[PDB]
């Protein structure tokens, strides 16, 4: 039985009082993690090679995830059964070294550690033919699925509230990788096409985006005993809302009172990313990220995002270090032109099982400080029926209420463990 | 740590549109599985021999099941803790080779693969003395439990709605097996007696069945490098509703609005079964089933069921085959004499880890087609209070509404994995 | 992968009718377990040493618990993710043999088997430095967390119902152990300080206890090839309600209708305990417990508790025994001076994997008998709004209703498995 996973768990306090709090800029899609995570999260994998005959083999893999608030011992929770798939390597003579798989599986996820941001992830139930050797590089094919809460209707109606049927979306993915465009550099290219797949006779709202495209290109260059990736992505319509490769072609959302509202996503998004990890000598290691993301929608409710931060680690011993992280966000509302921003600074003393910034288990003792000044927010007051601006970007003082997080300060501090096995 | 289980997971599409659908005849208790399963289902077992001293040993066993819709990545679910038992072999000198066990355990289940039908299953919490050698065969004894949602009352009342207390049922099982009635053939005989066990002073409805019998006889004959089982079962009253060995002696049910209705089951059932798997040479394998089941109840709401189907596999290679399944159902309403029926045809190309129709992991690519013509259905419109025919078999056009599945067609197709380890 | 746990599961019946019942004296905090447990409970641990370099190592540990009613096969449940921590041994040169850990962890629990009573348990999320060698003994330090459902308010109000905010409590623990005060004897001393940690600006009710102390001293003396522990504990205010080391400094509770009531706990508690297990020769083993616990609160609603019982085992064979348990409780209401009491006698024939009263797996067949005479109870009739005595100790016949369990009898009997691996 193979046992693997990820887990993070801990204890913390807030300067001003009570249990620890975490800071994320309103409008951004990520927070700088170090000493800024507030949950016990864990994935327990148990897989096993069930048959091998020479080169031919069949691997079985599973993954059950748990997320709890870590404010008590006995914490009950509905766990999520995220993967249960089978991969068969070399079973097809004519296309050697390639795998065929089917099942619920996390498929080639591309992410950015310090921000816990995943920029290319189409995982879900699915199937595919992986690593076909095309000579200059390796070609892979896959189809995965997702499905939005409602968004379809049993009959034509002008009433949005009639569109409460779960509406399924399909994604077709093609990638070409490990192409050595230069010395030390590699190039991957991928194309994603997603569409809402409707039941016989159901209909979507008028103006519903229905489908879309995602185009990815990533260059991986080896450097300073580390690496540096530079990405460029472009998405259209149904691919813009999630922006990782999954489609939401229905345009319909829901208030907590189950009333439907309209989150139409026709428009486009452009992402420019560069992140990496380099070692500069024997006593220093450092991770870094820089990004610019622009979601411009037809309905003027997009955003323009900027981030940068660095995590330099200095090693006193092969198992004791002092890690520090500094990050900055700035988000501008497409609808109002106002700007939200913040910056975080964390200082931690860790003990890892490795001489790397990439090595875990790690045990930390830390202190974090953050100052923000947010001038806009999302209007979620009311009901999607009571409110006509439900879900729209509005200024901080709109109609005398307060929107946004304010212009304030805070510091927290505590102890935590983190680990992938 | 011993790791075992079962899991099935995949992706699919329906000809006419949307995610894949599955076909089961209204009134039948099973569907022909190949390319006709719509869930990710999985059982993860982790057991371990905890003590051995010679012949004497103690085994610990557990089983946690998960069922999800496989239409998304993160799918939370309440898992079911189905087994947690301890079996002690040879601990009793005077009755050698026998085991004593206690705990929640799946106990000697008899089922029919292609239809996923279990015809003899009394699993649940329980205890027993297993495999006592009686010379001509092996004798086993057990007591297991079940409990219906409500059906008991704290005081005598004429009001059904007063009978909302969980009512427990007990089962006492005795089997005698591995009797060689002929060359290559074996005979098992079993008797099940179930009864509702009431709390001091509680009462059941008038006319409540209260108890019942299940009688089983199964002959296993070795043939064509395979086998063929022929079963005959007979049940009375409380054993007729579930019809696998568990008792439901209260006769009370519940609408989604929690109103109680009366599903009295006095009557009887007779089942005739023959299924098996045979290899005809080196390039062909085939599974087959034939059944006739008649539930005749005192209230005229029974059914008369017929099924037949075959799954012949032809092997191109020791790991590539083409499997095909053809099945047919026909159910007649006891109350109305009308008949529902359907037939399915599936064609699949698989890759297994074996040269057997019985060997998994398996990875499939398939297409299924089904045509049905149902003339009767169950009336579930309304409320058990609003409706007086709530839950009764009624014709397709009864009071102008539509009951049944209709007279239609459809085809689906996709990819799936399946595996027991 | 290391696999460990605990599990208990089984089947039972009640003399007078229905599924088995269990007996616990109203007002006591425990029941004598043998043949008196009514659930399938289980903890599955999967941990693993992930890195070792000489003396230095990092261990990863997890624990998922399941509790079900064992009255049916398929029993769905929300499981509780109770531990997920990392312990690093010898990572700090200057304080050898000591461990630093962080994460959700069960930390040094002290309990009494036959009554399933835990008398010193501060487990929960947390962190600490363990086993520092102080020469005469070993010194350990830790901080763990808990959090009450509500009890805090966003603004000052006189209305209790305004205090519905989850209010977090912190605990700071210090222990000094393995001090050989005598030949064969050891002494542990510990101090716990708990307090409610409020969010900036929140307030607690007036009179709220807010904090408290727990003082523990335990002497472990080796005897009759077994041991005997003698404990003395003293707690004040917020430490009195749970009385194991966790703080509940808010004083607010909640009716099932979510109305808040006031369970103020200013006061103190004193506990005197002595329990142990001794072998007297080769054919006898016996566990025993004696306790006196007095919770005296400012609001007159405390209790004065007394227990004693013994579990003597006689061994016919190295794997067959006859175990018997006899227990007695007597609880007196501080508010009314009335007394509740009961006594239990169980007789069982077991088969263990060991010649010890402490050895499992065990498989039992038993019969239990209990007679009680309760003269007081807690008033839970009504609503915390409807009722002004909601939650108070009141006599058995108060206002003509019946409170308490009565003056009665009963016997049950069945089969069960129990095991820690």
Swiss-Prot record, chains A, B, C:
<feature type="transmembrane region" description="Beta stranded">
    <location>
        <begin position="167"/>
        <end position="179"/>
    </location>
</feature>
<feature type="transmembrane region" description="Beta stranded">
    <location>
        <begin position="98"/>
        <end position="105"/>
    </location>
</feature>
<feature type="topological domain" description="Extracellular">
    <location>
        <begin position="299"/>
        <end position="301"/>
    </location>
</feature>
<keyword id="KW-1015">Disulfide bond</keyword>
<dbReference type="GO" id="GO:0005363">
    <property type="term" value="F:maltose transmembrane transporter activity"/>
</dbReference>
<dbReference type="InterPro" id="IPR036998">
    <property type="entry name" value="Porin_LamB_sf"/>
</dbReference>
<feature type="site" description="Greasy slide, important in sugar transport">
    <location>
        <position position="74"/>
    </location>
</feature>
<feature type="topological domain" description="Extracellular">
    <location>
        <begin position="106"/>
        <end position="131"/>
    </location>
</feature>
<dbReference type="GO" id="GO:0015144">
    <property type="term" value="F:carbohydrate transmembrane transporter activity"/>
</dbReference>
<dbReference type="InterPro" id="IPR050286">
    <property type="entry name" value="G_neg_Bact_CarbUptk_Porin"/>
</dbReference>
<dbReference type="GO" id="GO:0106234">
    <property type="term" value="C:outer membrane protein complex"/>
</dbReference>
<keyword id="KW-0406">Ion transport</keyword>
<feature type="transmembrane region" description="Beta stranded">
    <location>
        <begin position="184"/>
        <end position="197"/>
    </location>
</feature>
<feature type="topological domain" description="Extracellular">
    <location>
        <begin position="16"/>
        <end position="39"/>
    </location>
</feature>
<feature type="topological domain" description="Periplasmic">
    <location>
        <position position="1"/>
    </location>
</feature>
<feature type="transmembrane region" description="Beta stranded">
    <location>
        <begin position="132"/>
        <end position="134"/>
    </location>
</feature>
<dbReference type="GO" id="GO:0046930">
    <property type="term" value="C:pore complex"/>
</dbReference>
<comment type="similarity">
    <text>Belongs to the porin LamB (TC 1.B.3) family.</text>
</comment>
<feature type="transmembrane region" description="Beta stranded">
    <location>
        <begin position="226"/>
        <end position="238"/>
    </location>
</feature>
<dbReference type="GO" id="GO:0006974">
    <property type="term" value="P:DNA damage response"/>
</dbReference>
<dbReference type="GO" id="GO:0042958">
    <property type="term" value="F:maltodextrin transmembrane transporter activity"/>
</dbReference>
<feature type="site" description="Greasy slide, important in sugar transport">
    <location>
        <position position="6"/>
    </location>
</feature>
<dbReference type="GO" id="GO:0009279">
    <property type="term" value="C:cell outer membrane"/>
</dbReference>
<feature type="transmembrane region" description="Beta stranded">
    <location>
        <begin position="362"/>
        <end position="374"/>
    </location>
</feature>
<feature type="site" description="Greasy slide, important in sugar transport">
    <location>
        <position position="420"/>
    </location>
</feature>
<feature type="topological domain" description="Periplasmic">
    <location>
        <begin position="51"/>
        <end position="56"/>
    </location>
</feature>
<feature type="transmembrane region" description="Beta stranded">
    <location>
        <begin position="80"/>
        <end position="90"/>
    </location>
</feature>
<protein>
    <recommendedName>
        <fullName>Maltoporin</fullName>
    </recommendedName>
</protein>
<keyword id="KW-0732">Signal</keyword>
<dbReference type="GO" id="GO:0001618">
    <property type="term" value="F:virus receptor activity"/>
</dbReference>
<feature type="transmembrane region" description="Beta stranded">
    <location>
        <begin position="406"/>
        <end position="420"/>
    </location>
</feature>
<dbReference type="InterPro" id="IPR003192">
    <property type="entry name" value="Porin_LamB"/>
</dbReference>
<feature type="topological domain" description="Periplasmic">
    <location>
        <begin position="224"/>
        <end position="225"/>
    </location>
</feature>
<feature type="topological domain" description="Extracellular">
    <location>
        <begin position="149"/>
        <end position="166"/>
    </location>
</feature>
<feature type="transmembrane region" description="Beta stranded">
    <location>
        <begin position="40"/>
        <end position="50"/>
    </location>
</feature>
<keyword id="KW-0813">Transport</keyword>
<feature type="transmembrane region" description="Beta stranded">
    <location>
        <begin position="283"/>
        <end position="298"/>
    </location>
</feature>
<keyword id="KW-0998">Cell outer membrane</keyword>
<feature type="topological domain" description="Periplasmic">
    <location>
        <begin position="180"/>
        <end position="183"/>
    </location>
</feature>
<dbReference type="GO" id="GO:1904981">
    <property type="term" value="P:maltose transmembrane transport"/>
</dbReference>
<feature type="transmembrane region" description="Beta stranded">
    <location>
        <begin position="320"/>
        <end position="334"/>
    </location>
</feature>
<dbReference type="GO" id="GO:0006811">
    <property type="term" value="P:monoatomic ion transport"/>
</dbReference>
